[PDB]
């Protein structure tokens, strides 16, 4: 016999190819200032085309698109503090002083004096160190801090991610899928859900809902992070109870915090029934990877954006305590977290660089969902899983465990029992 | 803002090691943990960081982790190539200046 | 294949200032970073300062404070440190060592000269 060519029959072979965002119409219409560029809106024709008798090797930790989008939140947040003004002069020797005009707090802010080109201004213990009443900021000097613009806010929108023709995405559609081998169900779609650029550690705030799933590299591994998805979301209400004063000086402009209309500390609450609860189906389904011990103890130790747990909160960066919700131990048979506000943060680990969060007026609050959660194995009496995090990289894998890039060959041969003349 | 350390503990080939890390200072509990391995005439290559990730490509038998306001690393089946300086560095993030420990001292018997 | 190549060995004169030289391996700066570390002989190391082509800030020990001068060159992708006043205090050998990886995200010192 011969060979045949067929120009059209469906092959796959595993490609990194670069993807494009995807957003919507009237969601990219309310862009009020820049809360997070424009992005191409998709036409909501979802093909989901589900296929019969097919099965691909699906991967998580070894994906592409993790590195890939991680990188486009890198680059577009970088310009959303690239046209702000930078705060180089700004730093000189303060006069700060422990001013408590109303104790929830406890002394946090400081009634901050300068000596400017003489106003006076509010800083939390946290932005601010002491020197040797003589202060400063953290790192101004040997250090770099640029203000964000203060028309500007920081509030999640979902991003879809489609892929160019020639390219398709595969998508698992199992409902008992730890991330890793193949997987039955895998549906073709060119453009994904909704996934959200959703900044935060261990506690995973309004995120994609998953029964709760247990998912790592390697679980005998203690290194990998074990990243837990939540079948039933937790409400989380956080509250920062203080009215802001927004104070412009002319030095380019700096916004300082005025004084406090009448002061209460930031604090998260819990339904500590329901928490309770998830604890336990967590706990249950953890036992199926190992009857034993299991005890949970609050983060051990490092840098303030792993100990507590951070996120963000309409344009305001908390850091608050997990003590009240990792402390439990187990076997086979509203809580209130304290919250720190810190307005020189420098996310993403990076040295050097940091932004310099504006003050946002009245009082604070906002609600999400507590879908996901990130433990950390410790190093055979009982496995403490303390909280970990760190990483950024992490809470993107809690949405893309389920969509890989595939490059499409629709040419291919067979030796058919065919010939030409 | 300073890292204690063991002058030196030597260890039985195949057996299992700990090693202590203790530092002074509040902020030493807001600053991570690494651990770097240094032949005696060689460069340091990093070890462990992030207070319990490998980096890619090193042996598995290395791992550590943090307790309170102290530092500890751990090798399982210590063998005759694991002899070297192993130092505990403190980065504190809020003063912007990374501290290295004294350096403790491991020898294999033999 | 990624590499911190060095300068050769110094012998300096007590009173003077020395310079030493880093390059890049095929690699601009980018985003990452770059520390020096020296190592008494017979002695665990110790810090010496730090640098970030990227925004040219800076930063260094206390010890060596008003002693040591690091400078960058987006051009050629080197990294130079001066020290100055050299004493017998400073008899040492100082590695220059890269911090991060492709996103600057990191804080170790993972490749080494």
């Known amino acids: 016999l011969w060979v045949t060519v067929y120009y059209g029959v469906p092959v796959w072979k595993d490609a990194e190819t670069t993807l494009f965002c995807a957003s919507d119409a009237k969601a990219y219409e309310t862009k009020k200032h820049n809360v997070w560029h424009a992005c191409v809106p998709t036409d909501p024709n979802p093909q989901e085309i589900h296929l019969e008798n097919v099965t691909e090797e699906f991967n998580m930790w070894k994906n592409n698109m993790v590195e890939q989008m991680h990188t486009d939140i890198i680059s577009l947040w970088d310009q959303s503090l690239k046209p702000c003004v930078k705060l180089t002069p700004l730093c000189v020797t303060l006069q700060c002083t422990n001013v408590t005009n109303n104790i929830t707090m406890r002394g946090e802010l400081k009634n901050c004096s300068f000596n400017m080109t003489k106003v006076y201004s509010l800083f939390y213990r946290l932005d601010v160190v002491q020197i040797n009443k003589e202060y400063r900021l953290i790192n101004c000097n040997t250090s770099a801090i640029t203000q964000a613009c203060p028309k500007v806010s920081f509030e999640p929108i979902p991003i879809h991610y489609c892929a160019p023709a020639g390219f398709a995405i595969l998508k698992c559609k199992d409902k008992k899928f730890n991330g890793t081998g193949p997987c039955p169900s895998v549906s073709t779609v060119q453009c994904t859900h909704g996934i959200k650029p959703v900044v935060s550690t261990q506690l995973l705030l309004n995120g994609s809902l998953a029964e709760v799933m247990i998912r790592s590299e390697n679980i005998t591994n203690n290194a990998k992070n074990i990243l837990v998805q939540f079948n039933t979301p937790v409400q989380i209400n956080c509250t920062r109870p203080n009215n802001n004063t927004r104070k412009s000086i002319r030095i380019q402009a700096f916004y300082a915090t005025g004084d406090i209309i009448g002061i209460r500390q930031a604090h998260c609450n819990v339904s500590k029934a329901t928490w309770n609860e998830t604890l336990g189906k967590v706990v249950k389904q953890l036992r199926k990877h190992f009857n034993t011990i299991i005890r949970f103890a609050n983060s051990s130790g490092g840098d303030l954006e792993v100990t507590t747990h951070s996120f963000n909160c309409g344009g305001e960066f908390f850091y608050c305590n997990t003590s009240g919700l990792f402390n439990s131990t187990w076997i086979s048979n509203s809580i209130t977290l304290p919250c720190r506000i810190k307005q020189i943060i420098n996310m993403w680990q990076r040295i050097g660089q940091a932004m310099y969060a504006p003050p946002i007026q009245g009082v604070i609050r906002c609600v999400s969902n507590i879908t996901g959660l990130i433990l950390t194995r410790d190093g055979s009496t009982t496995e403490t899983f303390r909280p970990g995090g760190g990483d950024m990289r992490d809470n993107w894998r809690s949405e893309l465990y389920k969509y890989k890039v595939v490059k499409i060959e629709p040419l291919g041969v067979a030796p058919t029992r065919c010939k030409r003349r | 803002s300073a890292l204690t350390q063991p002058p030196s503990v030597s260890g039985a080939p195949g057996e299992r090691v700990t090693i202590s890390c203790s530092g002074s200072?509040?902020?030493?509990?807001?600053?991570?943990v690494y651990w770097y391995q240094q032949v005696p005439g060689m460069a340091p290559k990093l070890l462990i960081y992030?207070?319990?990730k490998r980096p890619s490509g090193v042996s598995d038998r290395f791992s550590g982790s943090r307790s309170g306001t102290s530092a500890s690393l751990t090798i399982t089946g210590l063998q005759t190539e694991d002899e070297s300086d192993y130092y505990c560095?403190?980065?504190?993030?809020?003063?912007?200046?990374?501290?290295f420990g004294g350096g403790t001292r491991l020898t294999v018997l033999g | 294949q990624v590499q911190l190549v060095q300068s050769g060995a110094e012998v300096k004169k007590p009173g003077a200032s020395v310079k030493v030289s880093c390059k890049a391996s095929?690699?601009?700066?980018?985003?990452?970073?770059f520390t020096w570390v020296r190592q008494a002989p017979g002695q665990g190391l110790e810090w010496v300062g730090v640098?970030?082509?990227?925004?040219?800030?800076?930063?260094?020990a206390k010890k060596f404070q008003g002693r040591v001068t690091i400078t960058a060159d987006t051009s050629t992708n080197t990294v130079y440190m001066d020290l100055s006043s050299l004493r017998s205090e400073d008899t040492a050998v100082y590695y220059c060592?890269?911090?991060?990886?492709?996103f600057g995200s990191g804080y170790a010192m993972d490749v080494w000269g």
């Open positions: 640098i970030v082509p990227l925004v040219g800030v800076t930063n260094s």
């Open positions: 200072g509040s902020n030493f509990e807001y600053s991570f």
């Open positions: 095929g690699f601009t700066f980018g985003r990452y970073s």
């Open positions: 992030d207070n319990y």
């Open positions: 560095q403190s980065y504190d993030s809020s003063l912007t200046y990374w501290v």
């Open positions: 060592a890269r911090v991060g990886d492709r």
